[PDB]
């Protein structure tokens, strides 16, 4: 397997100006300064960049890259994308199930995983967790070997890496590079980028490529680089690392001078001649959904702090609310306390639904990498990740709150009222979470999304129906009350609760009102707030909440779909 | 100036086991792996560590370190502590005013600053901002030269640095090291720690010190290190950096190398030489003035944070005025008045969360300047309160009051206006003080923000709107005295409802026809548990003031007992 590029020129200012080279089986490399388009070149050859800005031709054994090339090959990221909660074996099973064909029996996939583990020397750490903030973790070298394992499952002939040594120790880096050189012996082409390596690293190489300001300063066997620079009019003193020597030359101990020198060299002649010689889904939907949901549930259970803390906090809050509001009385203060407690419940759901921002934001890089590589579609990711995390964690707290408080406070003792309260709280939670997802999807910054959600909720509570009476609001501003989730939830709860209540002892305002200003029934309170007494006035809030849910989830899916994967 | 240490042994597990060495004028260095106590050793010699865990003696020209040594010497941190907003010259003036003596005329201090700028090659960037998130910044090399400038003001004979090259480019690092070698020629002792340098770096050195697991693997002139290792039974191939050679040797034993070095002649000579050797600055007002000046400059030079809040408060006032425009004396007047006042109070409480960021962000700078003798804790605390906290909390309350009071149609009297303003101001100050107390002496912002949010949420329940305070059980009602929103909301209600009638055609004040009407403000107040006497208005303010005092005292104490090391 040989990868050949000819007259690469990529512009967005051009990160690459003019580049020629070929890469044959072995431990090819790419060096240079940070701004030097080594990373850009690696992305270009791997096809993780926008084809439009490209201006040259790329070939493989004389054949252009097909459209399934990205899926076939392998690309290893600088920052590991593994799931810290899961075990090595579980991650490899995930990759094998999604990337490989479904026809193959699970036994063959397990055999492949075991083979990979044997090759990478992971037998002992097959079943140990990778590590997280709350979980104990294996060494970085094991992390990197795992990340490489996820890519060899499909047995790629070409393999790409981005700064494999960066973020590691010297001995670990050397061990990883020795492992890669072991792999290359089998007949795989390997391509990677390094930053200021050591001499053993620079010796392990078989081919070399050097860049600066998008300019090919050199290309050819690694050993001949020093000789070429010496013949160019530079001298390297002993105990000086050749790579650092090159970088110092680039810095100034100019660029066009070096590029012209290389163009005049024999290596460029041979490369150009060779180039001119050369020129003349995988799986179903249910499978992806099942495996994505399984992984998300494993991660959820393997991070108990986040979920269990919220559950415990909701239990404590229910107990406190029950204690404060214990024994609601049918007197003047009953209206105030009922309205307050229902408002608090609704707003607590809305504000606690801010955690959904962290859902898609955190796993953005993994999502992109797995979508490009052909693991799954966007639909499966979205739906499975909703079905796994969002659903249960929003459903449980509402049930807990309802069960705890309903009987302690002494709300209407009927099954229908109980279940309506539960259902309304559930819908409010789902709607707020969907809003959060829509705001936060396709982002990497959590702060801005949290701020936006907080501001929106704050402006929503004003129109809830407690602080300001909705009838009094001017007509040119009242229409905004239909963009409030707390309004709908609070209205439904009030309707379900006040409809059969009397708040004046000794007086029958329902039959006839002696004094025009008393507010001695629930119906008077409702009508004074702008609420209807018909059942439709209870369920239209629910249908509105459902429509909001649908709209927000559709928006989130669209925001994921049109996100730039490159 | 010679710094000599003998049988250093520091334990907290010992980061240093047994170390001997001397450092003479020149470009001394300290190398090793990350866990190797190079940073710990540098802190020990600089005296930025707890003396109790120390177990050896440290001398300077044969004399032990005095207690004013930390102030006299200089220490440069890995992460620059400069004020990005301010200019180079302003930072140097700050350091000169605080560190140097007050007797000296400002002209001499300006002369010293100009001399330092000339030495460091900063003449061109004297008056350009260092840089921040919103402001354009100078190169990292200029940052580091500035950081060094703040330390040479007092003309130290000894100078310490921690990873000066880390976080820089190769050429910039080489330039900085060449600058340091230029300085050493004048007669200053310099000590620093590096991580895997390059060969030119390793050649610039005059003395070398190597460490691993708290073990002195080598000490002596840098050139002789390679010869010593060669004579020990190791060989270095060409094109291999000597420092990387040492580190590879360490990686692959430790006790073997330590014993080898003990057997060497360098250890003999060092031990012999050691055994031969053995046998506030400023007033208070000045610190307060300069700290406040710096904080105000930084505040003005970060317009986004303040101006955004001011604009947001203006917008919120306009929106509130629009929604609640024209409050009516009918059944809905009570509801709307209570709601708007509750919203104002809670908005102040929740917007006062930004105060968490105040002391948390500048913790490292505060520690470094307190150790070095710039200022006391009192001056820092009071000046930083007087500069940032005061105006930014005072303005929004005035804006809210002016905008909404007349739009809504609250009581048209001057006294009510000013009471509303004063109450909102006190609420804001009290919540900010609470935030400072929670967040002082911390480096993590998230936990403090969460705690403040939770406390405010539990405070609003007892405010006096969601739950009537009379109904609450006696074994739980006492908690209502730990609420700031309660006091503010009660004061506002008292100031507003006291002269209102909410039923048209009816005089409940004189006599109530129906026992359940709520046709006056007094009935609403009494039903909520509020007193009608003036004392029932001002006791809330005195309680808020007491909270302010308590919280600020707690914050000062939390700063005072913070571990500076």
């Amino acid at each position, epitope marked *: 397997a040989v990868l050949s590029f000819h007259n690469i020129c990529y512009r967005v200012k051009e990160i690459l100006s003019n580049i020629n080279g070929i890469m044959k089986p072995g431990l090819n490399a790419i060096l240079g300064p940070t701004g030097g388009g080594k990373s850009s070149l690696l992305d270009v050859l791997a096809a993780r960049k926008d084809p439009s800005g490209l201006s040259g031709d790329v070939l493989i054994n004389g054949a252009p890259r097909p459209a399934n090339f990205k899926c076939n090959s392998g690309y290893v990221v600088q920052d590991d994308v593994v799931m810290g909660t899961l075990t090595v074996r579980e991650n490899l099973q995930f990759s094998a199930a999604l990337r490989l064909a479904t026809t193959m029996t699970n036994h063959e996939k397990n055999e492949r995983i075991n083979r990979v583990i044997q090759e990478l020397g992971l037998d002992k750490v097959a079943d140990s967790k990778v590590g997280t903030q709350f979980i104990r973790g294996v060494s970085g070298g094991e992390r990197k070997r795992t990340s490489i394992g996820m890519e060899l499952i499909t047995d790629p002939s070409i393999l790409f890496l981005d700064e494999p040594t960066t973020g590691l120790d010297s001995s670990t880096a050397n061990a990883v590079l020795l492992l890669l050189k072991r792999m290359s012996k089998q007949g795989r082409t390997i391509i990677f980028s390094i930053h200021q390596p050591r001499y053993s690293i620079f010796k392990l190489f078989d081919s070399l490529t050097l860049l600066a300001s998008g300019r090919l300063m050199f290309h050819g066997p690694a050993q001949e680089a020093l000789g070429y620079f010496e013949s160019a009019g530079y001298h390297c003193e002993a105990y000086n690392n050749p790579a650092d020597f090159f970088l110092d030359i680039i810095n100034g101990d100019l660029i066009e001078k070096l590029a012209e020198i290389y163009v005049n060299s024999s290596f460029y002649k041979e490369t150009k001649a060779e180039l001119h010689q050369l020129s003349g889904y995988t799986t179903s939907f249910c499978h992806q959904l099942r495996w994505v949901s399984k992984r998300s549930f494993k991660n959820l259970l393997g991070n108990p702090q986040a979920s269990i803390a919220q559950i415990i906090v909701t239990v404590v809050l229910g107990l406190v609310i029950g204690a404060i509001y214990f024994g609601l009385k049918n007197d003047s203060t009953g209206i105030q306390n009922r309205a307050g407690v229902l408002f608090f419940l609704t707003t607590n759901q809305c504000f606690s639904s801010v955690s959904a921002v962290e859902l898609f934001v955190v796993e953005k890089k993994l999502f992109i990498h797995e979508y490009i590589s052909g693991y799954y579609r966007v639909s499966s990711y979205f739906l499975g990740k909703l079905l796994s995390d969002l659903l249960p964690m929003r459903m449980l707290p509402s049930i807990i709150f309802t069960c705890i408080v309903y009987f302690m406070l002494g709300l209407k003792p009927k099954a229908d009222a109980f279940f309506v309260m539960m259902f309304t709280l559930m819908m409010v939670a789902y709607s707020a979470s969907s809003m959060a997802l829509a705001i936060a999807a396709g982002q990497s910054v959590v702060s801005v999304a949290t701020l936006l959600m907080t501001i929106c909720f704050v402006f929503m509570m004003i129109f809830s129906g407690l602080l300001v009476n909705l009838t009094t609001i001017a007509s040119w501003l009242s229409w905004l009350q239909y963009f409030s989730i707390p309004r709908y939830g609070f209205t439904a709860l009030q309707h379900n609760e006040f409809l059969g209540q009397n708040f004046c002892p000794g007086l029958n305002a329902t039959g*006839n*009102n002696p004094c*025009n200003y008393a507010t001695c029934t629930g*119906e*008077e309170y409702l*009508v004074k707030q702008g609420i209807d007494l018909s059942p439709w006035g209870l369920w239209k809030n629910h249908v509105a909440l459902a429509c909001m849910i649908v709209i927000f989830l559709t928006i989130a899916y669209l925001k994921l779909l049109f996100l730039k994967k490159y | 100036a010679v710094l000599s240490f003998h049988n250093i042994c520091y334990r907290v597990k010992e980061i240093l086991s047994n170390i001997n060495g001397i450092m003479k004028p020149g470009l001394n260095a300290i190398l090793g792996p990350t866990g190797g106590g190079k940073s710990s050793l540098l802190d020990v010699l600089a005296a930025r560590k707890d003396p109790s865990g120390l177990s050896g003696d440290v001398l300077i020209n044969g004399a032990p370190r005095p207690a004013n040594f930390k102030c006299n010497s200089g220490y440069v941190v890995q992460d620059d502590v400069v004020m990005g907003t301010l200019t180079v010259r302003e930072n140097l003036q700050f350091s000169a005013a605080l560190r140097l003596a007050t007797t000296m005329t400002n002209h001499e201090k300006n002369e010293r600053i100009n001399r330092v700028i000339q030495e460091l090659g900063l003449d061109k960037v004297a008056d350009s901002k260092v840089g921040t998130q919103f402001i354009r910044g100078v190169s990292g090399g200029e940052r580091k030269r500035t950081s060094i400038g703040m330390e040479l003001i007092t003309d130290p004979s000894i100078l310490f640095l921690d990873e000066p090259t880390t976080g820089l480019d190769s050429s910039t690092a080489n330039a900085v090291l060449l600058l340091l070698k230029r300085m050493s020629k004048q007669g200053r002792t310099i000590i620093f720690s590096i991580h895997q340098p390059r060969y030119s770096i390793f050649k610039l050195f005059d003395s070398l010190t190597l460490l691993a697991s708290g073990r002195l693997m080598f000490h002596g002139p840098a050139q002789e290190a390679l010869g010593y290792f060669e004579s020990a039974g190791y060989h270095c191939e060409a094109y291999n950096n000597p420092a990387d050679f040492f580190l590879d040797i360490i990686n692959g034993l430790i006790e073997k190398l330590a014993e080898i070095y003990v057997n060497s002649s360098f250890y003999k000579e060092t031990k012999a030489e050691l055994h031969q050797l053995s046998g506030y600055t400023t007033s208070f007002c000045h610190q307060l003035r300069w700290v406040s000046k710096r904080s105000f400059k930084n505040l003005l030079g970060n317009p986004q944070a303040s101006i955004a809040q001011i604009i947001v408060t203006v917008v919120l006032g306009l929106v509130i005025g629009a929604i609640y425009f024209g409050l009516k004396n009918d059944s809905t007047g009570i509801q709307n008045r209570a709601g708007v006042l509750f919203f104002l109070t809670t908005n102040q409480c929740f917007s006062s969360v930004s105060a968490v960021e105040l002391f948390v962000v500048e913790k490292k700078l505060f520690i470094h300047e307190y150790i070095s003798g710039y200022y006391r804790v009192s001056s820092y605390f009071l000046g930083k309160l007087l500069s940032d906290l005061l105006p930014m909390r005072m303005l929004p309350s005035i804006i809210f009051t002016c905008i909404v009071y007349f739009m809504l149609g609250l009581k048209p009297k001057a006294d009510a206006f000013f009471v509303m303003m004063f109450t909102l101001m006190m609420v804001a100050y009290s919540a900010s003080s609470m935030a400072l107390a929670i967040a002082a002496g911390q480096s993590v912002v998230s936990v403090a923000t969460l705690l403040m949010t939770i406390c405010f949420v539990f405070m609003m329940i007892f405010s006096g709107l969601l739950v009537n305070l009379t109904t609450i059980a006696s074994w739980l009602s006492w908690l209502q005295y730990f609420s700031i929103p309660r006091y503010g909301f009660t004061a506002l209600q008292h100031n507003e409802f006291l002269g209102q009638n909410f039923c048209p*055609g009816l*005089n409940a004040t004189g006599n109530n026809p*129906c026992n359940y009407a709520t046709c006056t403000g007094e009935e609403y107040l009494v039903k909520q548990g509020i007193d009608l006497s003036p004392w029932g208005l001002w006791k809330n303010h005195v309680a808020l003031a007491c909270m302010i005092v308590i919280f600020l005292t707690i914050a000062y104490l939390k700063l005072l007992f913070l571990k500076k090391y």
Partner: antibody
Amino acid sequence: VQLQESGPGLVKPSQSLSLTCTVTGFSITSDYAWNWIRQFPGKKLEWMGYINFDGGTTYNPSLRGRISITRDTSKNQFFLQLRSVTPEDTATYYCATFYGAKGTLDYWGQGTSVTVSS
Amino acid sequence: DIVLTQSPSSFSVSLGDRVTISCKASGYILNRLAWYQQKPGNAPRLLISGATSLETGFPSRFSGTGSGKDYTLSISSLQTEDVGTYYCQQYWSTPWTFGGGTKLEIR
């Protein structure tokens, strides 16, 4: 408790309108609310506004700024000022009373006609 | 606002007969409904408050009934003196609205 309207029986278009109701048997600053009501030809009652016992007032939105109601507590009078008159607002005008505890208009006046022509 | 509707703008009955009159509201009124009786060339006179109560000065031949939006007035065995124009008023919301009128006649 005993009311009596008074005022011009004829007005020019888009000039003004002013009426007066004198109360006997009660002080208008004591308990009640005092309304103004009109009945167009082709009987269609309309409510215009009131002034409470504390000086507060409330008006019908359909009359946007054309109407203002005042009082003179010296002799127990409350007035009507309807400006920018049109021939459409020719009708019979009444002064009435509104308790508030009961809610209804108990006591009325005899009514005075008003003609807007030229 | 709240607009009140009286479907029978006119009626036609004889003495001893029983006649029923109705008012429909656009919103919930909660028995804040009143009925006024107007003879020609006279001011309206209050007749019923609260949709059921009767004012002193009238016989116990007038009755009121209704809940929510639908209210009716019942005149059982009307005499001659009961001929005239009747109105329904709502005093729930500040822009008080009357009905259009229901003129009785005689056959």
